[PDB]
Amino acid sequence: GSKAVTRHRRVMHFQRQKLMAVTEYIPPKPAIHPSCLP
Amino acid sequence: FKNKTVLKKRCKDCYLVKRRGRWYVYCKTHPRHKQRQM
Amino acid sequence: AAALARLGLRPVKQVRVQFCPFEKNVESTRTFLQTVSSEKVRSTNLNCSVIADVRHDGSEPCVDVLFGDGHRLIMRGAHLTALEMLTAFASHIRARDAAGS
Amino acid sequence: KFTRSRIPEKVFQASPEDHEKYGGDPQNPHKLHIVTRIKSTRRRPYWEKDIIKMLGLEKAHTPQVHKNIPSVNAKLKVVKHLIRIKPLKLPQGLPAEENMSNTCLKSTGELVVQWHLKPVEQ
Amino acid sequence: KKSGGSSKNLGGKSSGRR
Amino acid sequence: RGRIPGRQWIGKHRRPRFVSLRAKQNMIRRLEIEAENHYWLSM
Amino acid sequence: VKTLLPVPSFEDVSIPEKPKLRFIERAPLVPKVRREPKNLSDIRGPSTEATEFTEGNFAILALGGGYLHWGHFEMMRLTINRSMDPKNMFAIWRVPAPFKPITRKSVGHRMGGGKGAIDHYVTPVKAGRLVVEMGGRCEFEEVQGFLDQVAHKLPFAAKAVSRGTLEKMRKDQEERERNNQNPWTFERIATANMLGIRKVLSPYDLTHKGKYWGKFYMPKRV
RNA sequence: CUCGAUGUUGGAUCAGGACAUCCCGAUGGUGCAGCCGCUAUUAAAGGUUCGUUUGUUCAACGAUUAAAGUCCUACGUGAUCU
RNA sequence: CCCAUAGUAGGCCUAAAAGCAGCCACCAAUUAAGAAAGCGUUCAAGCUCAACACCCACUACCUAAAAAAUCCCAAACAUAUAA
RNA sequence: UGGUAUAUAGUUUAAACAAAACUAAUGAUUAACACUCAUUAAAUUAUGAUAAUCAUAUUUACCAUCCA
Ligand code: FES
Ligand SMILES: [K+]
Ligand SMILES: [K+]
Ligand SMILES: [K+]
Ligand SMILES: [Mg+2]
Ligand SMILES: [Mg+2]
Ligand SMILES: [Mg+2]
Ligand SMILES: [Mg+2]
Ligand SMILES: [Mg+2]
Ligand SMILES: [Mg+2]
Ligand SMILES: [Mg+2]
Ligand SMILES: [Mg+2]
Ligand SMILES: [Mg+2]
Ligand SMILES: [Mg+2]
Ligand SMILES: [Mg+2]
Ligand SMILES: [Mg+2]
Ligand SMILES: [Mg+2]
Ligand SMILES: [Mg+2]
Ligand SMILES: [Mg+2]
Ligand SMILES: [Mg+2]
Ligand SMILES: [Mg+2]
Ligand SMILES: [Mg+2]
Ligand SMILES: [Zn+2]
Secondary structure (H helix, E strand, O other): OOOOOOOOOOOOOHHHHHHHHHOOOOOOOOOOOHHHOO | OEEEOOOOOOOOOOEEEEEOOEEEEEOOOOHHHOEEEO | OHHHHHHOOOOEEEEEEEEOOOOOOOHHHHHHHHHHOOHHHHHHOOOOEEEEEEOOOOOOOEEEEEEOOOOEEEEOHHHOOHHHHHHHHHHHHHHHHHHHO | OOOOOOOOHHHHOOOHHHHHHHOOOOOOOOOEEEEEEOOOOOOOOHHHHHHHHHOOOOOOOOOEEEEOOHHHHHHHHHOOOOEEEEEOEOOOOOOOOOOHHHOEEOOOOEEEOOOOOOOOOO | OOOOOOOOOOOOOOOOOO | OOOOOOOOOOOOOOOOOOOOHHHHHHHHHHHHHHHHHHHHOOO | OOOOOOOOOOOOOOOOOOOOOOOOOOOOOOOOOOOOOOOHHHHOOEOOOOOOOOOOOEEEEEOEOEEEEHHHHHHHHHHHHHHOOOOOEEEEEOOOOOOEEEEEOOOOOOOOOOOOEEEEEEEEEOEOOEEEEEEEOOOHHHHHHHHHHHHHOOOOOEEEEEHHHHHHHHHHHHHHHHHOOOOOOHHHHHHOOHHHHHHHOOOOHHHHOOOEEOOEEOOOOO
């Protein structure tokens, strides 16, 4: 097996991969683009 | 032409142009400044 | 200036710029005068005379160029940009240069 | 090392917003849970396999009723990721000896004391 | 095949005292 | 071409697995159930 | 009428007597005899030491974990000293000299036969640590160029920062967490063991909160 | 994996493939005058020698050639040979 | 993009140091231009930049590749209401 | 190709702040020499950093080198 700290980016367990995908930052999206308003 | 991953203008007469799907540096004053995106 | 100076005024016998400064449509013609009257452009050919005529008759501005070959170029700046006039002026210079030689 | 998980007590402190979302009353807590297993115990530590047995949740999708008390909730918290918890609602009160045999647990969590299998005349 | 060295730490095999 | 060294889903170099849209929806669907479990265990 | 603005003044600033970076030795003066375990946790997670500015206003900020051997120190020293203006600039080391011994076995040897002999020394670094700090009568734009050149040559992700840009970095990360529209966060799911997720997570993830993976720091993770 | 056997170097025979091009083709740069070179881009259709010593692969040497390429193919190939 | 005169080749050191090998100062003429930010000259010349004028450049200020050996490798598709 | 060592007057040779040896010149000595003695002249492979110690490439020495 591989150690917890590696030189390459270690592959994540799929459950963890799904965790990361589901918890990604979602920025606040305004209803109307601010550039389209006075 | 020398292949370069990072294109840099080497004099004031160097100009960046995108041709055939890749970026080139052309220079008429110093033809040695010619670069091709790698 | 530099762009026009690089070509030179070898085949230009005389350049005459006529405009009415009090009018509101002379900005383009006056900008043309500033470019052609530059020290660099004039230095290319010392036999070419740049003549600036200031009139208050109310007529529209005009630019008259006389080449050594005898052909003339009349550019009316009432509805022309300085860049357009300079571009046409340079083209005729190139044409009259090859003809004479 | 993988070990049992201590859940911070703050996780189980409902905010005013939660009461609006789920519709519970903090001053009138429900008496009984409806607990259903919805997730396998395979690939789970042995201590979670054991508590599912203690709660009678060996068969999935089979509702079991449990008391809403600290000791029971302590077991439910260990397997909260394997089950679905809903409050038991008694719209017509508790079943009586007369209507013991005419009850039905609906999917809404309401235990009705009459099951006529007839359309509503209303 | 290279000839290897040996460990210089002996002892240290005591069992737990319970 | 395109071989994965050794066995596909173990070891240092593995076949990359990607998270589909429905895999995300499946996880979020179960997160909502557990979030509600927390609520009913609070009273 | 192009509008001029007041130029910043550095009259209060004072340059130390030794502005240039001092020499870092390959190994400690007294060689270590006891061989140490690998202890990779010393480059894992956020840094707790040397995270704040001290004397200067500019520095190189670590964005990952890694070990600095003597070769790196020479690259940093020669590049900064050659590029800096000694009269108006001063630089100090924000990392200790190589002190952790690294063992190596003889070439071609088999597994076993005891631990290897000490070969060289390294300096462990964690993400968020200032590696070199610069100051003096200069602006960030003056030193940003050669500081970024040094940062690119380090064995870990790094970037030249200043007192202003470092504070803006931290404020942006705090704002992203506050305005995040995703109702689900790695912290909430991990600390509550939702879905039994802790069966695939490390005990360190309770404090790392998905921002660190091995020695790598993920700045866009909230 | 194979020891109720997957015969072990170099050579002969016949070669399939890669291109990170030795020669031949087409281009950019040059501290490219020209003749020769150096470096890079593109190109794998075709070609890539004969000898003395050594079992040798290599290496050295002699005489040549537009060139005497680098690799993989169970360090290709012994139910074809040596 | 446009444009560039001048106390003056500041003093010092130096065979020579003229904005630009080093050391010190870094003041002043012109509405405007650093005792000079980058090239250049044996030293000078010479070409730019920061100035003025003209005048809406009405700048992004996050980075950036690819090569192997029998023969690429499902076919395809940006449009009809989340099931 | 690969590492391991390598360098000091003109030469020869310990050691780096430069010691002796020979050759060179000068004196003392002899009738004149040689010998001897004294004195003088005379050097650290050159490049970058630590500040005089590690590197850097050279330099020549030194062993290493299909395979079954
Ligand atoms: S689309 Fe509304 S401002 Fe451009
Ligand atoms: K694998
Ligand atoms: K790096
Ligand atoms: K066998
Ligand atoms: Mg492990
Ligand atoms: Mg013990
Ligand atoms: Mg024991
Ligand atoms: Mg496989
Ligand atoms: Mg058999
Ligand atoms: Mg063939
Ligand atoms: Mg090719
Ligand atoms: Mg061929
Ligand atoms: Mg074979
Ligand atoms: Mg036979
Ligand atoms: Mg066979
Ligand atoms: Mg002056
Ligand atoms: Mg002077
Ligand atoms: Mg001077
Ligand atoms: Mg000048
Ligand atoms: Mg000079
Ligand atoms: Mg300017
Ligand atoms: Mg005598
Ligand atoms: Zn150029």
